[PDB]
Design a protein around this ligand. Structure first.
Ligand SMILES: CC(=O)N[C@H]1[C@H]([C@H](O)[C@H](O)CO)O[C@@](O[C@H]2[C@@H](O)[C@@H](CO)O[C@@H](O[C@H]3[C@H](O)[C@@H](O)[C@@H](O)O[C@@H]3CO)[C@@H]2O)(C(=O)O)C[C@@H]1O
Ligand SMILES: CC(=O)N[C@H]1[C@H]([C@H](O)[C@H](O)CO)O[C@@](O[C@H]2[C@@H](O)[C@@H](CO)O[C@@H](O[C@H]3[C@H](O)[C@@H](O)[C@@H](O)O[C@@H]3CO)[C@@H]2O)(C(=O)O)C[C@@H]1O
Ligand SMILES: *[C@@H]1O[C@H](CO)[C@@H](O)[C@H](O)[C@H]1NC(C)=O
Ligand SMILES: *[C@@H]1O[C@H](CO)[C@@H](O)[C@H](O)[C@H]1NC(C)=O
Ligand SMILES: *[C@@H]1O[C@H](CO)[C@@H](O)[C@H](O)[C@H]1NC(C)=O
Ligand SMILES: *[C@@H]1O[C@H](CO)[C@@H](O)[C@H](O)[C@H]1NC(C)=O
Ligand SMILES: *[C@@H]1O[C@H](CO)[C@@H](O)[C@H](O)[C@H]1NC(C)=O
Ligand SMILES: *[C@@H]1O[C@H](CO)[C@@H](O)[C@H](O)[C@H]1NC(C)=O
Ligand SMILES: *[C@@H]1O[C@H](CO)[C@@H](O)[C@H](O)[C@H]1NC(C)=O
Ligand SMILES: *[C@@H]1O[C@H](CO)[C@@H](O)[C@H](O)[C@H]1NC(C)=O
Ligand SMILES: *[C@@H]1O[C@H](CO)[C@@H](O)[C@H](O)[C@H]1NC(C)=O
Ligand SMILES: *[C@@H]1O[C@H](CO)[C@@H](O)[C@H](O)[C@H]1NC(C)=O
Lengths: 450, 450
């Protein structure tokens, strides 16, 4: 059966710490198992852009493979797998692959998000025919693809044109981080360029968000800072489109015929559009947003939807006030810049929240989250396992030596309800001496909480 | 269905050059695909000892995994997979894993050899409770295990005591290299120590084999060199047992109840016992023998069996006169030593024969074989893809830079009958900077023959 070992099924997508109390952390050493993530078979072949979802009954995984240089494009292929958590005699679980699908048909599917769905996986891709910058310069979004891969080896792929895309967008691509399936809804992260003179572009022209770190403020008048923040949404790198995060939401019930819906947040509540991830913990939804724009700290929002009688839906989001570690960036968008600027920079590094933030009783200031960061303010280098509070890092554990190059990281934690062990898997693009750019490594760790 | 793409089914286990003529070769660049061989998930965790068999309808693979250093031994786990050859849009096939079995029960299965069998894989292991030297010092062979893994997810394991084992052997272990299934027979490579005072020990006491390289002889008298060669079979490292190669042959018909049989070759025809591989190409059988003893060149024998009235079977082998490249070794067992001396050294590097040697018409002096060697006479370093004639190397293609550490290599070639493409997969243990000692890398290349 396509189902996790029973000691994990009730420890998945849970808040591990409902204490609201203060805690100290220790991140254990990497636990050895056969990697479920395949490496390149050539020194110069490219494997990048991981997407991982651990669902209650199984997990889904995907990444992009190129038989050429990473910089080189042309077409690429997409490795997709699904499997379960299985306990080993070693004392810890292992990710056991049950199904593999290697999409190699010459269609250049990229920026793909995967989601765990009943009896399988759903992947959202766009078909790339040109440079990303050309994509934003143009007036027409690329082809949007939704593919369904089931345990019974059935694979179905559809082109979709979600409600709200045509006429409003220069491009749209998936947000690379995993999406979720909840309550007959399939929801993916997405982002792209909004045509500033379109209906949507005109309705959202005024909107902007300016997060402030009280412990490291940006000097200037509020109105100047505000207008700079508003203008950061229109980078010239992307042809001054309004770069916008959006949510692809699909009725699972009608997933074979539905064109889906594009639900767009208010930019009063969110930063410039970027890669992201949708999480469902307990039944509260969250959104990770990559810091591509000027704000260097970790972006995590509590979100909620209103699906209006199956009309045009809305989403409300609320920023969790996090400013602890900083992501690397280039130029005036580096990890040291805290001030409003037009930026296309940063790197994908998502958090796994160990605690609720807002709950029924109140707000938890003792919020904790874990992940892998890159210890540098400029360079993608020095991958470091971490646990972080809102204002400060609770614990740090470097992977590898100083000078080890690493890029994207995605983290998922789950609990063994049999022995109460808390496991975190840090999936990170790491530079390998022998295989193509970035062996994507799932390192599994036991997390000790006091 | 467990079956290779149709284009490769008639291109597997064939002599791809039946020309008997001279040829030139070019080894293509590595072709990128998702690796079917999982890596370690920890920087210092062990992954070693690959065994690979490509059958007409599918392939079988296994290697050993330890959550500790390679040197420290407590227990290990055994990764097993099976799958098919599938064509990609990239222009070349890919190894698609269809079933994974991770044997992790705390039993230390070691030196395992895998074989492709109908609807699955068969693996021959021994359970290691102690040092190999302790094994040879003792009087009792370790536990011999035979495990059957089928596509229908059934896995069956038996302890076996092959005919001829009890009382005649101090130890026996599998050859590591893959075994084969042919004519209702399952045949694995094996080796171990023979008790010199036993029946087998006294019957084989006179036997020895002393190969000579005509272009690089060992200077000295025949009689003295001969007794030195006889004495090389009894290393004090292995407690002066007679170190002996053998074949585990099993009736597939009765595979659930049979105890199997040990068929032991005459040491007049073969060197000191070691790791090895059984090949079936066309319908003739070959045996690769690791050069653990003093002879530094590549050992490949044409072999044939006589199964006498289901009584005690016999095996005849005939050395193919190869002296071209040399394997690395230590001390007076290095790649430069051509003279009989007690050695326990060398490394596993198996050849794939592209041409028949002996045929009905005669013997092919234009014999060619391909594989991966280590360019050093002392150190396991500088992995190099090669095609070799009997006396000389036809072509060389280094993997990586100078100083790259590599150990065991196993090579398999097959032909696409659709476009006549010849593919060779060189599976090698390579030192990785991020994962535990020995990312086992399957590098696939197209071989050009003129
Ligand atoms: C659809 C897509 O291309 N996604 C890529 C993302 C997006 O570009 C990002 O979310 C912005 O929308 O980013 C990734 O690609 C970056 C990577 O190739 C690096 C290589 O070092 O370059 C980035 O472009 C840089 C460029 O290298 C600089 O010279 C300068 O011009 O700025 C641009 C933009 O920062 C790529 O965006 C990524 O790895 O970060 C991955 C996706 O392929
Ligand atoms: C059942 C088993 O132990 N198989 C191992 C084989 C066998 O030892 C070999 O076929 C001889 O029968 O060899 C491999 O292990 C060797 C490896 O661990 C190296 C490490 O560098 O050491 C070898 O033992 C050396 C020893 O290190 C030296 O100090 C000296 O005493 O000589 C001995 C023998 O050369 C191990 O044999 C191997 O990797 O080659 C693999 C199997 O674990
Ligand atoms: C208006 O939108 C179109 C896309 O149809 C775009 O080409 C044009 O440059 C936009 N003008 C401005 C000011 O954004
Ligand atoms: C495979 O599974 C999906 C589950 O939704 C089902 O809809 C589909 O009919 C199945 N296909 C086959 C051939 O069984
Ligand atoms: C966003 O905020 C601006 C002022 O900063 C305001 O003009 C606009 O009405 C707001 N829009 C929404 C949806 O809140
Ligand atoms: C939406 O989120 C904002 C925080 O950005 C919060 O103040 C507001 O109450 C939420 N709106 C609704 C209708 O819940
Ligand atoms: C980065 O590295 C330095 C030492 O190289 C260390 O002192 C510092 O704390 C690290 N920072 C983080 C966020 O890990
Ligand atoms: C003789 O054989 C016995 C078992 O029959 C064994 O214990 C012993 O090791 C052998 N002696 C030598 C010198 O090999
Ligand atoms: C699996 O296959 C083997 C032979 O291929 C067969 O003997 C065995 O009965 C099968 N197991 C099950 C549960 O059907
Ligand atoms: C092996 O050769 C020896 C002499 O070296 C001879 O006495 C013996 O008869 C031969 N045995 C076999 C099986 O060939
Ligand atoms: C066995 O192989 C030998 C070569 O070592 C060869 O001379 C002979 O033909 C074979 N013996 C038999 C009985 O076929
Ligand atoms: C070993 O390396 C040297 C270059 O350092 C090269 O000239 C030589 O041909 C190589 N030998 C083999 C067998 O690859």
């Amino acid at each position: 059966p396509l189902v996790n070992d029973l000691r994990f099924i009730n420890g998945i997508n849970k808040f591990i710490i409902e204490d609201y109390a203060t805690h100290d952390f220790s991140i254990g050493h990497p636990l050895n198992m056969p990697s479920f993530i395949p490496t390149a078979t050539s020194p110069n072949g490219c494997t990048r852009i991981p997407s991982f979802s651990l669902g209650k009954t199984h997990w889904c995984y995907t990444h992009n493979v190129i038989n050429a240089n990473c910089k080189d494009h042309t077409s690429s292929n997409q490795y997709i797998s699904m499997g379960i958590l299985v306990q080993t005699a070693s004392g810890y679980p292992m990710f056991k692959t049950l199904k593999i699908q290697y999409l190699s048909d010459g269609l250049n599917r990229k920026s793909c998000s995967i989601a765990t769905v009943p009896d399988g996986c759903a992947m959202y891709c766009y078909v790339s025919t040109q440079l990303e910058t050309d994509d934003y310069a143009g007036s027409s979004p690329p082809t949007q693809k939704l593919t369904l891969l089931f345990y019974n080896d059935t694979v179905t792929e559809r082109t979709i044109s979600p409600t709200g895309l045509e006429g409003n967008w220069a491009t749209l691509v998936p947000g690379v981080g995993s999406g979720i399936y909840f309550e007959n809804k399939l929801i993916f992260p997405a982002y792209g360029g909004v045509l500033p003179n379109s209906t949507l572009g005109v309705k959202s022209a005024r909107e902007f968000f300016r997060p402030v770190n009280p412990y490291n403020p940006c000097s200037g008048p509020q109105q100047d800072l505000d207008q700079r923040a508003l203008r950061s949404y229109f980078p010239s790198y992307f042809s001054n489109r309004r770069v916008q995060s959006a949510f692809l939401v699909c009725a699972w019930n009608q997933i074979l015929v539905t064109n889906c819906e594009l639900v767009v947040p208010s930019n009063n509540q969110t930063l410039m559009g970027a890669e992201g991830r949708v999480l469902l913990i307990n039944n509260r939804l969250l959104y990770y947003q990559r810091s591509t724009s000027w704000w260097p700290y970790e972006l995590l929002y509590e979100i909620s939807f209103t699906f209006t009688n199956s009309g045009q839906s809305s989403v409300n989001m609320s920023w969790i006030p996090i400013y602890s570690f900083t992501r690397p960036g280039s130029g005036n968008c580096s990890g040291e810049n805290v001030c409003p600027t037009a930026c296309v920079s940063g790197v994908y590094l998502d958090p796994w929240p160990l605690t609720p933030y807002s709950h029924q009783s109140g707000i938890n200031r003792n919020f904790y989250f874990t992940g892998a960061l890159l210890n540098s303010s400029t360079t993608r280098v020095n991958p470091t396992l971490y646990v972080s509070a809102l204002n400060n890092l609770k614990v740090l554990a470097p992977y590898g030596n100083q000078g080890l190059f690493a890029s994207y990281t995605t983290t998922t934690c789950f609990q063994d309800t049999g022995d109460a062990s808390v496991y975190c898997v840090y999936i990170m693009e790491l530079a390998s001496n022998i295989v193509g750019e970035f062996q994507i490594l799932p390192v599994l760790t036991r997390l000790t909480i006091t």
